[PDB]
Amino acid sequence: DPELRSWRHLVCYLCFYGFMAQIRPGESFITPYLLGPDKNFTREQVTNEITPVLSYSYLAVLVPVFLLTDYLRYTPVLLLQGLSFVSVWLLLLLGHSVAHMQLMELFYSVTMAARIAYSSYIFSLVRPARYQRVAGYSRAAVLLGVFTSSVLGQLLVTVGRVSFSTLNYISLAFLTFSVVLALFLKRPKRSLFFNRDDSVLARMLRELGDSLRRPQLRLWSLWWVFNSAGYYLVVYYVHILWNEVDPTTNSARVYNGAADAASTLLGAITSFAAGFVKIRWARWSKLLIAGVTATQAGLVFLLAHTRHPSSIWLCYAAFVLFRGSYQFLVPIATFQIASSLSKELCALVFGVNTFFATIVKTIITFIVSDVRGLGLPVRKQFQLYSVYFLILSIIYFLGAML
């Protein structure tokens, strides 16, 4: 029967690919590997010359990949995301100079721009009547897969006391295996913009001069540009700030995997506890992004103020609570933006909100972090994001009056 083969051989493989594509045990230990003794990079080379290329090339590969995710029907970009991940972990094993690691982040931002590849691959593959179940099984296999990689990465370092190079060699045994699984993925019969079934890009602009008159799209798409640009400027640099607090050899005590597993677990509890409040807390929505942004302002300042190496555990939990605070709003942000919009347009306004959050992320990184513009250290940059989230909290809270 073609019903059992469409679930046991397709959906049980679709959740298995989304599990195994997220298995990267050395994902949370990239910057401890670079700052470690094996690669010997200083904290000024990774903060001012390597990680700014992660925010530059992500501007340069966002709109090419998003236009080529739909032209190729999502399967070569799901192959490109897996194959560029192999190219990252080859440069983390065969790269010495700082010019090699600037190519490591350029290949890493390809895998950052292709996060919407697999999320929109399930929309084009499965039937529209049975999409809410398969995407429910797909977001419970990626989120399980991105939680297991932070636990398997942590357990194979703390419990199984091996070096970081043994860990990232294990991470090639789960990334070449994610290229093999991405070869055997079914190309969907339809796309979203280019390979349709048959106005396009004329009906949408008619449905955008009037949909932008809505106040929630005038607010949450203005939160996605600015609050979700300073959020990625923390997550890129918080692994350097943890290494500035407690620079440690004897590598079984780094605990970056447990602060990425707990921030996924709090990024799912506070996301599941956000589906209950996306309807009720829609009246004073600008007050909700005024308290959480101020909660994100007090946690970015807590990261920039801890100094003793024995107080790093109140610095991991300042990031687990930070990553869970942003993950409380994106279920509400992806609902209040995609409420009245069509699926051929809400996934377009998420290609503008992400692109405008990447111009802002490129503006701040060239101004506050890159060695050509200012070149600040990772602690004097995190005090420039505590002001940035607090300025964003005397705008939404000040805007709550008007």
Side-chain angles (χ1 to χ4, degrees), residues 40 87 210 217 281 357:
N40 193 14
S87 199
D210 298 6
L217 187 49
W281 296 350

Side-chain angles (χ1 to χ4, degrees), residues 257-385:
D260 199 15
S263 74
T264 295
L265 200 62
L266 210 70
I269 287 181
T270 299
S271 162
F272 163 70
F276 300 146
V277 301
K278 56 191 178 186
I279 283 288
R280 293 166 176 85
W281 296 350
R283 180 192 186 179
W284 35 61
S285 51
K286 69 189 63 172
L287 184 56
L288 181 60
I289 60 180
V292 179
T293 311
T295 312
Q296 289 179 26
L299 289 174
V300 163
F301 192 83
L302 185 50
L303 294 159
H305 209 259
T306 54
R307 240 51 166 264
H308 280 15
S310 303
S311 171
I312 195 57
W313 286 279
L314 280 82
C315 187
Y316 292 134
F319 179 70
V320 176
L321 256 299
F322 173 76
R323 195 155 184 178
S325 282
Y326 173 83
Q327 282 296 137
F328 174 73
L329 290 181
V330 175
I332 313 178
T334 50
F335 185 80
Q336 302 286 341
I337 290 176
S339 70
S340 179
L341 284 174
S342 63
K343 213 69 169 59
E344 62 178 8
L345 189 47
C346 81
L348 188 67
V349 63
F350 288 151
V352 186
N353 283 331
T354 310
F355 181 73
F356 280 159
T358 325
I359 286 183
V360 174
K361 206 194 307 180
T362 313
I363 281 304
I364 302 175
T365 316
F366 183 76
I367 283 302
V368 63
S369 189
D370 195 288
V371 86
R372 302 193 304 274
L374 197 43
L376 289 184
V378 83
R379 190 175 299 273
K380 300 179 59 54
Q381 181 181 337
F382 260 70
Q383 283 177 169
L384 256 293
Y385 299 151

Side-chain angles (χ1 to χ4, degrees), residues 107-118:
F107 289 151
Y108 192 79
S109 59
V110 170
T111 80
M112 290 205 60
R115 293 174 310 188
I116 209 182
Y118 184 80

Side-chain angles (χ1 to χ4, degrees), residues 166-203:
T166 305
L167 179 77
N168 278 314
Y169 271 140
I170 286 176
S171 180
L172 267 184
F174 291 132
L175 274 183
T176 58
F177 186 64
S178 171
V179 178
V180 173
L181 291 184
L183 292 172
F184 309 136
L185 275 176
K186 175 168 184 48
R187 308 184 60 180
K189 310 290 179 54
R190 61 199 173 100
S191 295
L192 195 56
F193 288 104
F194 294 150
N195 308 17
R196 306 176 62 92
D197 306 332
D198 300 337
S199 299
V200 188
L201 301 188
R203 189 175 307 272

Side-chain angles (χ1 to χ4, degrees), residues 89-104:
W89 263 259
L90 281 180
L91 291 184
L92 283 190
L93 263 307
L94 311 178
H96 314 87
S97 80
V98 82
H100 288 250
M101 298 313 174
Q102 291 193 324
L103 208 58
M104 189 265 302

Side-chain angles (χ1 to χ4, degrees), residues 28-225:
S28 311
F29 308 95
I30 292 177
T31 59
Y33 193 29
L34 296 170
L35 298 164
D38 203 10
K39 287 303 166 189
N40 193 14
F41 283 75
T42 67
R43 261 179 310 275
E44 203 267 343
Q45 286 173 343
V46 193
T47 322
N48 303 142
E49 283 169 16
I50 303 179
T51 299
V53 175
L54 181 53
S55 296
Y56 289 163
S57 62
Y58 185 44
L59 183 64
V61 307
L62 181 56
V63 296
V65 160
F66 168 68
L67 286 176
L68 287 187
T69 299
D70 233 2
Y71 195 84
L72 305 182
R73 296 175 164 185
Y74 302 96
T75 316
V77 180
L78 268 181
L79 178 60
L80 185 66
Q81 180 213 6
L83 199 54
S84 165
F85 258 144
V86 175
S87 199
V88 168
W89 263 259
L90 281 180
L91 291 184
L92 283 190
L93 263 307
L94 311 178
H96 314 87
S97 80
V98 82
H100 288 250
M101 298 313 174
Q102 291 193 324
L103 208 58
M104 189 265 302
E105 307 277 354
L106 188 129
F107 289 151
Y108 192 79
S109 59
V110 170
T111 80
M112 290 205 60
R115 293 174 310 188
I116 209 182
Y118 184 80
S119 306
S120 178
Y121 170 76
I122 323 290
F123 177 74
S124 297
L125 187 68
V126 313
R127 289 190 160 102
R130 275 181 290 263
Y131 170 67
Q132 306 295 329
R133 185 186 172 179
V134 179
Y137 276 79
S138 165
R139 299 182 319 269
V142 168
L143 187 132
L144 181 61
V146 86
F147 164 75
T148 319
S149 90
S150 300
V151 168
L152 189 63
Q154 183 61 43
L155 287 181
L156 289 182
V157 171
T158 297
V159 173
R161 295 98 30 193
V162 312
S163 60
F164 273 146
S165 297
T166 305
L167 179 77
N168 278 314
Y169 271 140
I170 286 176
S171 180
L172 267 184
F174 291 132
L175 274 183
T176 58
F177 186 64
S178 171
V179 178
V180 173
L181 291 184
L183 292 172
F184 309 136
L185 275 176
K186 175 168 184 48
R187 308 184 60 180
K189 310 290 179 54
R190 61 199 173 100
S191 295
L192 195 56
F193 288 104
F194 294 150
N195 308 17
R196 306 176 62 92
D197 306 332
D198 300 337
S199 299
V200 188
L201 301 188
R203 189 175 307 272
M204 301 179 184
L205 295 188
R206 189 191 179 186
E207 293 171 2
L208 213 65
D210 298 6
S211 186
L212 208 66
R213 207 183 186 92
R214 206 152 55 100
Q216 296 303 289
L217 187 49
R218 278 175 180 178
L219 174 71
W220 292 87
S221 165
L222 206 57
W223 170 94
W224 200 289
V225 173

